[PDB]
Amino acid sequence: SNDPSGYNPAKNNYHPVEDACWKPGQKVPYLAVARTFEKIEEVSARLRMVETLSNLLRSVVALSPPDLLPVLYLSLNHLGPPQQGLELGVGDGVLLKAVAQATGRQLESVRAEAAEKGDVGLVAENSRSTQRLMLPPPPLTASGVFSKFRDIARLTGSASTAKKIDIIKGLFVACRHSEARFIARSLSGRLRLGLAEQSVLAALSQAVSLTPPGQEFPPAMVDAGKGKTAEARKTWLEEQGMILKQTFCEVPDLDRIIPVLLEHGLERLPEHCKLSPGIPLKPMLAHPTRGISEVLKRFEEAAFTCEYKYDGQRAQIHALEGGEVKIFSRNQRDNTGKYPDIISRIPKIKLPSVTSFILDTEAVAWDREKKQIQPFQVLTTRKRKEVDASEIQVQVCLYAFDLIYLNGESLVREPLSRRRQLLRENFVETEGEFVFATSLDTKDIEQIAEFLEQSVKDSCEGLMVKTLDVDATYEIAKRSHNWLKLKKDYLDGVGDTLDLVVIGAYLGRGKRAGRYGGFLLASYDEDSEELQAICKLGTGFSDEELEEHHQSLKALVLPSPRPYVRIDGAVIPDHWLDPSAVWEVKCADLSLSPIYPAARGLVDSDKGISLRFPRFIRVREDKQPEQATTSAQVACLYRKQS
DNA sequence: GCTGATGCGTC
DNA sequence: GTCGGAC
DNA sequence: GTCCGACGACGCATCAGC
Ligand SMILES: *P(=O)(O)OC[C@H]1O[C@@H](n2cnc3c(N)ncnc32)[C@H](O)[C@@H]1O
């Protein structure tokens, strides 16, 4: 209809035709998407966000079906299917430079304003573009903006950054109302709607259920739920939602799903898009569990297995009928070129009767000389793409723990008891190359506890716990976190805690805007009587605790750092703090840092020590900096990881 | 042709 | 990756 | 329990700057 600026997709009794802000066949205006983001961000109830997005999507289906795919990608802040590897190459650095040039302001003024407001979108929105003529360019369209994002991502090579900035400046010149806010957030990778993949899928299945695609215009059926009771409508939308969710979890690729959805409908979708080797799928995840008693409470009387939780990276290995092999990451990225050693070993791990499979494994760095597992840090030094087999320096051992597909059979609906038996019988172990995850089938608390201790002694993070027959399938759509993860450092009073000094604070972004979002911490070097930065910290405190931190550190702000505080290459804090507050901090491991100075020279000549997965536990009101954990104590903790 | 800063992915 | 907030 | 977005260390790949 008329004037996107007034578009209200949160409206009660939203009518997909009469309440749209564009006419049939027209391109969806980007302002329509921006206004939808505004109405989503204004509320906290996830179900209300879904309804609002569904309203937009229903208008897109009814009026401009070719724009459904770009509108969906804009709402997820994706560029396309993950296995295609498109990357903007734009962070806050490029973005802030483009905003400075677009608005004619100094880069430093823009950087300072972004940090104080905690959002680059607000800076871009509230400053005019000095490249704008008297008469604006035509309004942005959803598909136009999406295509420009893709243009940015495809620019490569020398002088490519300047070309990316030119595209961004062009977008800002054409923005109206709130559009610049969401372009900027999207480019920075921080859309921060409160609505993401699961809510987008729920909105999509609701939208195509209520307003079916493919109708002759004007659509005879704009609300297919209106003839049902509230109860019947809810059950129906839940069923339709699960059809979409389960297909997506097997084929998480909107380029494949959306054309089928528009042509054949949601009910026929599983017939056209099915799990198959060569198409990455969503992996099964794990829920953190803070004790053995919590495990037994979660699984009740269902038999379960405990497995070592190996410290590497996930590798989803696909063997296609015909011999081709592909390897994908946890997030559906193509890692095939990264593992020529693994690909060459596939004939060695599968019996000759296996014609196709999808394996779920952990790739762990392996020292062939000493025949033992190596830390994650070592694994991350492998090259990432177009790697040749002879050039591999860090060997990998695969620890296999699941089987999702075998000889043409999808196993997603099969219980782990059967998947595991098929894994054990059709694949071959080779020490230090391909091994089944160490496992224990028991319900005895004393055995589980001992097994947890042994997993740590054997260079693992803890245990994974999985039911064998009750709710034991690989249906991510039913429950994405169907497994449990049990780590020692989850236990209170157990694991490595340090008492560290707060030496700086960083202004918060997003949910943390208007206060501190992070802090710089330091250990005390006895030998030089200096405080050495050891890590940053940004999780572990409640919202109330964070407000107390803000009020207790405000009096410690210094304009300039103390000469006995050393941070070297760490990110300079927005506010320096007089060393006084001491906090108890927990971590999973200690790592060798190329940047932090803490304990430098005590374990390595060039590298200090930092914390893996640090989190705030509590303030140490009874400690001053002189009694904080020493750099020598940090080195001793690092060494005993062996 | 090299180095550092930036981006993005891994955990 | 950990964590807490909102539902 | 689910979903989400605050925030963590770290390393390769890339490209601006030299
Ligand atoms: P996150 O800490 O949420 O844990 C899940 C990941 O752990 C890895 N992993 C290692 N060993 C296993 C076993 N035995 N089973 C399942 N997952 C395991 C995977 O890479 C998961 O992504």
Residue numbers in the entry: 260 to 901
Published text:
Of the three human DNA ligases, LIG1 is established as the replicative ligase, completing ligation of the >50 million ligation events during DNA replication in addition to ligation events during DNA repair. Human DNA ligases utilize the energy of ATP and catalyze phosphodiester bond formation to seal breaks in the DNA backbone. X-ray crystal structures of the three human DNA ligases (LIG1, LIG3, and LIG4) in complex with DNA have revealed a conserved ligase three-domain core architecture that encircles the DNA nick, induces partial unwinding and alignment of the 3′- and 5′-DNA ends, and distorts the 3′-OH strand into a C3′-endo sugar conformation to adopt an A-form like geometry. Unexpectedly, we found a conserved Mg2+-binding site that forms a junction between DNA ligase domains and the 3′-strand of DNA.
To more directly dissect the contribution of metal coordination to ligation fidelity, we generated an additional E592R mutation and assessed ligation and abortive ligation profiles on undamaged and 8oxoG-containing substrates. Similar to the LIG1E346A/E592A mutant, LIG1E592R displays markedly attenuated abortive ligation, and enhanced nick-sealing activity on 8oxoG:A and 8oxoG:C substrates. We further determined the crystal structure of LIG1E592R at 1.85 Å. In this structure, the R592 substitution occupies the approximate position of E592 plus the HiFi magnesium ligand, and forms a salt bridge to the phosphodiester backbone in place of the metal-DNA contact. Compared with LIGWT a small cavity is formed, but the interface is typified by a high complementary of the protein and 3′-DNA terminus. Thus, substitution of a direct protein–DNA interface for the native protein–metal–DNA interface is not sufficient for high-fidelity ligation. The LIG3 and LIG4 protein–DNA interface are comparatively discontinuous and are interrupted with cavities, resembling the LIG1E346A/E592A and LIG1E592R low fidelity mutants.
